[PDB]
């Protein structure tokens, strides 16, 4: 389908200017001006190149013998019977020209006739493409095509747009008047690069479609990276005493964010794990809790999946993960087995899948899985940090490329990420963006290095269209904008070499605003640039953890219903990510305030319902009862808890109440109101 030989199709008559580059699947190297440019649809000249294979005496001819020169294994055959062994792979390459053709497009065909007479166009199931690699294979040797991509110098140079017909696609020059009025994408790549992003696949493979298909998106650009990026969600916790006594387990939820650790010049995966502070008879001690004395170990066991948030999938070994508590007791080393994945790990997807269940880190009856052990110290210390940290590696396995031969797609046991990862970490701008859900999602992008000849060969990358191509920010009306939000509700952060880059960069301009001139701010390779949504706070690993009063405020403006039982609010999905919970509060006629869920770890009574709105259970810790409002001028106040002014510890004196807590009014209405 992918399969057949691979034709240069030139307006002028000597292979200069292509017009056309394509594959067509049998020897019908025709294109009709059907498929077509116009006065650039006259082409003079022509060059196919590719394999055949078969086992008999054969002749070949076309359907122009008199402007054609045809090459087999290097020897002439036209410009005469020749013997073809099966199952062996004879090169082909053929030259047509012709001055001044008077019909738009190439009617051309080629044909082969064996010893029982049989003449015709050669069929698909004998002809293959050619070797468009960085090295032969014993089979298919390689060889205006600098770098054996398939793409024309040329062509990668000045800029080109693949149309995808039904059966095959062109591959053929931009021009401003019929493409950009279309709406096709400009590509630009290097000549001189097979993978211009310095991934394991090549942009001719990335723009027509020779690729494995959980590559992402936005990474079938030659100037964005493929590659995969990979952290370990943990969804929950279970600790345990270790050794018929009754179960004196603590079971807690957790929650997982990959980190980013400023913008900063890291390549490692990371995520951040916060274990539930909340609720879970009593407010005793871990260690009362599980009567652990001194002496004691305890033990945890988790539910994890790995997340794949980068743009190319993982095969045949799930990275390892270091499991550290503090900063840096490692508690354990996590391994899945190699080769024995279970599923491929996607690109913006879960394994296990969300569909299947998650894997425990000491499975059921899994013999040999090793206890994650803690000492009655590092016990106390999980208490009171209520924190652990995932550290995973980037040693991610082999990688399934195109093989031209038989045109599929294969793990390849001689290409493996670790042969990549470092190139193209040295060779691309990288853009970490939080404008999806909150999350951390990293992206590379191809960047010139001035001080890298090779590098210098590659197109100028802006600012503008980096986050276009990477993250599919588009222009609707004059204004960068990514789902609706303009660029300017994100701040832009830079590592310090960058933010000089940067800070030259404009000056030149003599632009005092970034955000008005994206479009001139050149990215170059080596350089981190940080874009975070400008309405929250964050912590140190760049996580969503608090906002503006205002914002909060306004947040929950919109009070679908409220009553003694609770509020009922439609919130922001992003809001209710920054928050740990509500406090409410009665206050009376003097001033005074009954605080109804007063303790720090009784703050979680929100709860999303099925239909998106939220609702506020004023019930929950009032023991089962809608609120008691004696006199109907009293006030039912509700606060907000942003998880940076979380309390998740009993305070020093041994306090466990709300007291002194940051809160946020958010509701506030007086009995009769109500
Ligand atoms: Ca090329
Ligand atoms: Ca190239």
């Not at 090459?71 to 390459?93: A, H, M, P, S, T």
């Not at 652990?388 to 590696?393: A, E, V």
């Not at 406090?583 to 239909?611: A, F, H, P």
């Amino acid at each position: 389908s992918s399969q057949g030989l691979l034709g240069y199709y030139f307006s002028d008559l000597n292979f200069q200017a292509p017009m056309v580059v394509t594959s067509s699947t049998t020897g019908d190297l025709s294109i009709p001006s059907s498929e077509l440019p116009s006065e650039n649809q006259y082409f003079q000249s022509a060059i196919w190149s590719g394999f055949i294979k078969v086992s008999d005496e054969y002749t070949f001819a076309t359907s122009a013998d008199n402007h054609v020169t045809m090459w087999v294994d290097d020897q002439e055959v036209i410009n005469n019977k020749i013997r073809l062994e099966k199952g062996r792979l004879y090169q082909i390459k053929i030259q047509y020209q012709r001055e001044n053709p008077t019909e738009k497009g190439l009617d051309f065909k080629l044909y082969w006739t064996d010893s029982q007479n049989k003449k015709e166009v050669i069929s698909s199931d004998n002809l293959q493409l050619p070797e468009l690699k960085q090295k032969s294979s014993n089979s298919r040797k390689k060889r205006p095509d600098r770098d054996n991509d398939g793409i024309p110098d040329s062509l990668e140079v000045e800029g080109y747009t693949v149309d995808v017909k039904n059966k095959r696609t062109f591959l053929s020059p931009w021009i401003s008047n019929i493409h950009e009025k279309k709406g096709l994408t400009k590509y630009k790549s290097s000549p001189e690069k097979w993978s211009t992003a310095s991934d394991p696949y090549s942009d001719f493979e990335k723009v027509t479609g020779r690729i494995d298909k959980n590559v992402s998106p936005e990474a079938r650009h030659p100037l964005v990276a493929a590659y995969p990026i990979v952290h370990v969600d943990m969804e929950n916790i279970i600790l345990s005493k270790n050794e018929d006594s009754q179960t004196r387990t603590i079971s807690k939820n957790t929650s997982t964010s990959r980190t980013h650790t400023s913008a900063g010049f890291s390549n490692s995966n990371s995520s951040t794990v916060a274990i539930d502070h909340s609720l879970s008879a009593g407010e005793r001690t871990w260690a009362e809790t599980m009567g652990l004395n001194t002496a004691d170990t305890a033990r945890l066991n988790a539910n994890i999946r790995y997340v794949n948030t980068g743009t190319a999938p993982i095969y045949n070994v799930l990275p390892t993960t270091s499991l550290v508590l503090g900063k840096n007791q490692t508690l354990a080393t996590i391994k899945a087995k190699e080769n024995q994945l279970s599923q491929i790990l996607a690109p913006n997807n879960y394994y296990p899948s969300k569909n299947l269940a998650p894997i425990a880190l000491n499975a059921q009856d899994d013999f040999s899985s090793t206890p994650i052990t803690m000492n009655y110290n590092q016990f106390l210390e999980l208490e009171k940090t209520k924190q652990l940290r995932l550290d995973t590696d980037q040693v991610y396995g082999n990688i399934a490329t195109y093989n031209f031969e038989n045109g599929r797609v294969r793990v390849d046991t001689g290409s493996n990420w670790s042969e990549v990862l470092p190139q193209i970490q040295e060779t691309t701008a990288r853009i970490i963006f939080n404008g999806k859900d909150l999350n951390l999602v990293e992206r590379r992008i191809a960047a010139v290095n001035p001080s890298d000849p090779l590098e210098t060969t590659k197109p100028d990358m802006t600012l503008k269209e980096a986050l276009k191509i990477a993250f599919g920010f588009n222009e609707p009306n004059g204004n960068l904008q990514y789902q609706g939000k303009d660029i300017t509700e994100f701040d832009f952060n830079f590592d310090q070499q960058t933010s000089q880059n940067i800070k030259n960069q404009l000056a030149e301009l003599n632009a005092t605003n970034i955000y008005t001139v994206l479009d001139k701010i050149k990215l170059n390779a080596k350089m981190n640039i940080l874009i975070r949504d400008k309405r929250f706070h964050y912590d140190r690993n760049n996580i969503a953890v608090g906002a503006d009063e205002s914002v909060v405020k306004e947040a929950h403006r919109e009070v679908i219903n409220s009553s003694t039982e609770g509020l009922l609010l439609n919130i922001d999905k992003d809001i209710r990510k920054i928050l740990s919970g509500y406090i409410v509060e009665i206050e009376d006629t003097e001033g005074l305030k009954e605080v109804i869920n007063d303790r720090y770890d009784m703050l979680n009574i929100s709860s999303l319902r099925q239909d998106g709105k939220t609702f506020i259970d004023f019930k929950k810790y009032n023991d089962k009862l809608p609120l008691y409002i004696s006199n109907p001028n009293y006030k039912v106040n509700v606060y907000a808890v942003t998880k940076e002014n979380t309390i998740i510890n009993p305070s020093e004196n041994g306090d466990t109440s709300t007291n002194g807590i940051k809160k946020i009014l958010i509701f506030s209405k007086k009995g009769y109101e109500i």
